[PDB]
Curated annotation (Swiss-Prot), chain A:
DNA-dependent RNA polymerase catalyzes the transcription of DNA into RNA using the four ribonucleoside triphosphates as substrates. Second largest component of RNA polymerases II which synthesizes mRNA precursors and many functional non-coding RNAs. Proposed to contribute to the polymerase catalytic activity and forms the polymerase active center together with the largest subunit. Pol II is the central component of the basal RNA polymerase II transcription machinery. The lineage of its organism: Eukaryota, Fungi, Dikarya, Ascomycota, Saccharomycotina. The binding of ribonucleoside triphosphate to the RNA polymerase II transcribing complex probably involves a two-step mechanism. The initial binding seems to occur at the entry (E) site and involves a magnesium ion coordinated by three conserved aspartate residues of the two largest RNA Pol II subunits. Belongs to the RNA polymerase beta chain family. It comes from the Eukaryota. Transmembrane segments: none annotated. It comes from Saccharomyces cerevisiae (strain ATCC 204508 / S288c) (Baker's yeast). This is DNA-directed RNA polymerase II subunit RPB2. Component of the RNA polymerase II (Pol II) complex consisting of 12 subunits. Coiled coil: none annotated. It is found in: Nucleus.
Swiss-Prot record, chain B:
This is DNA-directed RNA polymerases I, II, and III subunit RPABC4. The N-terminus is blocked. It is found in: Nucleus, Nucleolus; Peroxisome. One of its GO terms (cellular component) is nucleus. Component of the RNA polymerase I (Pol I), RNA polymerase II (Pol II) and RNA polymerase III (Pol III) complexes. Component of the RNA polymerase I (Pol I) complex consisting of 14 subunits: RPA135, RPA190, RPC40, RPA14, RPB5, RPO26, RPA43, RPB8, RPA12, RPB10, RPC19, RPC10, RPA49 and RPA34. The complex is composed of a horseshoe-shaped core containing ten subunits (RPA135, RPA190, RPB5, RPO26, RPB8, RPB10, RPC10, RPA12, RPC19 and RPC40) where RPA135 and RPA190 form the DNA-binding cleft. The keyword Zinc applies. It comes from the Eukaryota. Its main location: nucleus. It comes from Saccharomyces cerevisiae (strain ATCC 204508 / S288c) (Baker's yeast). The gene is RPC10. Present with 907 molecules/cell in log phase SD medium. A zinc finger (C4-type) spans 6-26. Keywords: DNA-directed RNA polymerase, Metal-binding, Nucleus, Peroxisome, Ribosome biogenesis, Transcription, Zinc, Zinc-finger.
Curated annotation (Swiss-Prot), chain C:
Disulfide bonds: none annotated. GO terms for cellular component: nucleoplasm; nucleus; RNA polymerase I complex; RNA polymerase II, core complex; RNA polymerase III complex. The lineage of its organism: Eukaryota, Fungi, Dikarya, Ascomycota, Saccharomycotina. NCBIfam families: PRK04016.1. It is found in: Nucleus, Nucleolus. Its main location: nucleus. DNA-dependent RNA polymerases catalyze the transcription of DNA into RNA using the four ribonucleoside triphosphates as substrates. Common component of RNA polymerases I, II and III which synthesize ribosomal RNA precursors, mRNA precursors and many functional non-coding RNAs, and a small RNAs, such as 5S rRNA and tRNAs, respectively. Pol II is the central component of the basal RNA polymerase II transcription machinery. Pols are composed of mobile elements that move relative to each other. In Pol II, RBP10 is part of the core element with the central large cleft. This is DNA-directed RNA polymerases I, II, and III subunit RPABC5. One of its GO terms (biological process) is ribosome biogenesis. Present with 5300 molecules/cell in log phase SD medium. InterPro entries: RNA_pol_su_RPB10 (IPR023580), RNA_pol_suN_Zn-BS (IPR020789), RPABC5/Rpb10 (IPR000268). Zn(2+) binds at residues 7, 10, 45-46. There is a cross-link at residue 59 (Glycyl lysine isopeptide (Lys-Gly) (interchain with G-Cter in ubiquitin)).
Curated annotation (Swiss-Prot), chain E:
The keyword Nucleus applies. Present with 10000 molecules/cell in log phase SD medium. Its main location: nucleus. Signal peptide: none annotated. The chain holds residues 3 to 265 of 318 of the full protein. Component of the RNA polymerase II (Pol II) complex consisting of 12 subunits. It is found in: Nucleus. Changing residue 28 to D: In mutant RPB3-1. Belongs to the archaeal Rpo3/eukaryotic RPB3 RNA polymerase subunit family. GO terms for cellular component: nucleoplasm; nucleus; RNA polymerase II, core complex. Keywords: Acetylation, DNA-directed RNA polymerase, Metal-binding, Nucleus, Transcription, Zinc. This is DNA-directed RNA polymerase II subunit RPB3. Zn(2+) binds at residues 84, 86, 90, 93. It comes from the Eukaryota.
């Protein structure tokens, strides 16, 4: 009840819980966009959970490519879905 | 500009929060994120 | 997906002989062996390049978006 | 990631000289040159020509490891004859040979129809 | 002219069948290698992609583009970006080209190297012109577009060498042979019944005299007379590959005399 999660660039506040990889590649909607070149432990999906406990997806450590497609959808429960495919 | 594309009708959507996740006439609940304008450089190798 | 630009083994430019090769078969009703030599592909490394290629792009193009 | 840049096969990185000359202790009148950013193209050559010289007592080259671009050339020569000179000589002797060859080619080239 | 002597058999815009003679195998080889690895050439070495809705990937396309042979006739009048005193790339060390294609028709639209367009200033030197040798002036087939798909691109040709990447290679293959009659006995022939009957007699067996039954082994013969044939890919006139070959190899031994000297 009145406790969700949101895909948006996190920037530390009363929790600061985040991680090393940079978020500078995310857009304010919390998702990188196609064309952008990622690597290291870069953040591909920025998600938060309440004031702000970081719950974001960082790229696979040993990997690095270019974003090939980000898909935003909905489930049968009306859940916001996100699928980032990296090439 | 355009912040999103549609799974099918290709129409360049782009809406804020509470707008659910559909499109115009093609209520496809899919939508693609649209490329960046920050041109990517490639090594010809 | 598409005709490689060059023969992996030696470098011969081959990305310019796919349409020709294709015509040399349909419209001239030649055989791949003769067709290839007439395109100048004499050594087997370059031969395999074309004789073996699989033009899968033609199938990708059939997808709407 | 581990792969070094390809230009490092022909481009001297910093602190590197094209040649490192060293006095062989095992034998007299002998030296060991380390060519940096060079391979079998120059090695077998300078080696081969270094052999046509009769006052040359020993000439051999080898690239210790295919990973790095660099070969070692050992030259030994009769007393009074400096290996350094034999190399110079083996070089000029080569540079000429190639000049001649170049000419003869541009010559025969013209006499061709097409 | 006393020394390494050429003796061309065939010749054309692509091959230079010839016979090197009066030369150490080593030199015949070093020259063979250089033609393959160290002759400077222009080739797309950087691709900026504005738009690609094609069926391929940017890196995919970008790869082919670098394999598209480009005019490198006056290449020496161009410099390597790494030496050029500019910031990145200028008309003194590079050539910029463009590729814009839109699937307009409904039938499959093809994209070729002819559709590449120089945008920099060649300053008088023949350089950067995509090579074309097909009977219809199309050149290499870079991509295929369906109606509606697009491909906006910007490349940057630069001076490079084979050692760095095979795209900068001017040669295509280099037939090479010697002692077509195994007189020097450099190779030992494998056989089931008959060495002679099982192994085909190569081209160059006509250009030489078969040994004679009783003649003892010629233990002093060396390896001179090499039957080559260079094949250009187009970035450079065949005659040139050989020529410039002998050249680069020449400047190499030279950069060495200058080391001892300034040493
Ligand atoms: Zn729609
Ligand atoms: Zn081949
Ligand atoms: Zn410049």
């Amino acid at each position: 009840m009145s406790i969700t999660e949101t895909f948006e660039k996190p920037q530390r506040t009363n929790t600061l819980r985040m991680k090393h990889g940079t978020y500078d590649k995310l857009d304010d909607d919390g998702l990188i966009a196609p064309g952008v070149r990622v690597s290291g432990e870069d953040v591909i999906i920025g998600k938060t959970t309440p004031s702000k406990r970081d719950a974001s997806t960082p790229l696979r450590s040993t990997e690095n490519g270019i974003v090939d497609q980000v898909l935003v959808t909905t489930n049968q429960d009306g859940l916001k879905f996100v699928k980032v495919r990296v090439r | 500009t355009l912040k999103y594309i549609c799974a099918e009708c290709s129409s360049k959507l782009s809406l804020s929060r509470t707008d659910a996740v559909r499109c115009k006439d093609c209520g496809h609940r899919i939508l693609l994120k649209a490329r960046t304008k920050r041109l990517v450089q490639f090594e010809a190798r | 997906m598409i005709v490689p630009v060059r023969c992996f083994s030696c470098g011969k430019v081959v990305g310019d002989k796919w349409e020709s090769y294709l015509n040399l078969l349909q419209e001239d009703e030649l055989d791949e062996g003769t067709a290839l030599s007439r395109l100048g592909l004499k050594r087997y490394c370059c031969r395999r390049m074309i004789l073996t290629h699989v033009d899968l792009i033609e199938k990708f193009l059939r997808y709407n978006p | 990631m581990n792969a070094p840049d390809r230009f490092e096969l022909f481009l001297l990185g910093e602190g590197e000289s094209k040649l490192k000359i060293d006095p062989d202790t095992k034998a007299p009148n002998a030296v060991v040159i380390t060519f940096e950013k060079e391979d079998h193209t120059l090695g077998n050559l300078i080696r081969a020509e270094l052999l046509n010289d009769r006052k040359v007592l020993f000439a051999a080259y080898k690239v210790e490891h295919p990973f790095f671009a660099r070969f070692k050339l050992r030259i030994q020569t009769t007393e009074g004859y400096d290996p350094k000179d034999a190399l110079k000589n083996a070089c000029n002797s080569i540079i000429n040979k190639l000049g001649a060859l170049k000419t003869n080619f541009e010559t025969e080239w013209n006499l061709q129809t097409l | 002219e006393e020394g390494p002597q050429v003796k061309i058999r065939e010749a054309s815009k692509d091959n230079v069948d010839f016979i090197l003679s009066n030369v150490d195998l080593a030199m015949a080889n070093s020259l063979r290698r250089v033609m393959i690895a160290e002759i400077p050439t222009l080739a797309i070495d950087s691709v900026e992609v504005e738009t690609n809705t094609t069926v391929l990937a940017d890196e995919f396309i970008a790869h082919r583009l670098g394999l598209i042979p480009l005019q490198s006739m006056d290449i020496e009048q161009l410099e390597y970006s790494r030496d050029c005193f500019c910031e990145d790339h200028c008309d003194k060390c590079s050539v910029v080209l463009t590729l814009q294609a839109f699937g307009e028709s409904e039938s499959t639209t093809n994209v070729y190297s002819k559709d590449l367009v120089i945008v920099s200033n060649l300053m008088g030197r023949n350089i950067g012109h995509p090579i074309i040798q097909d009977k219809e002036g199309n050149g290499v087939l870079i991509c295929k577009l369906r109606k509606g798909q697009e491909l906006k691109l910007t490349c940057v040709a630069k001076k490079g060498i084979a050692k760095e990447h095979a795209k900068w290679g001017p040669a295509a293959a280099i037939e090479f042979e010697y002692d077509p009659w195994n007189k020097l006995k450099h190779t030992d022939y494998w056989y089931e019944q008959d060495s002679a009957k099982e192994w085909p007699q190569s081209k160059n067996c006509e250009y030489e005299d078969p040994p004679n039954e009783g003649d003892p082994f010629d233990y002093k013969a060396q390896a001179d007379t090499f039957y080559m044939n260079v094949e250009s890919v187009g970035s450079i006139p065949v005659d040139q590959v050989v020529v410039r070959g002998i050249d680069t190899l020449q400047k190499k031994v030279a950069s060495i005399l200058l080391a001892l000297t300034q040493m």
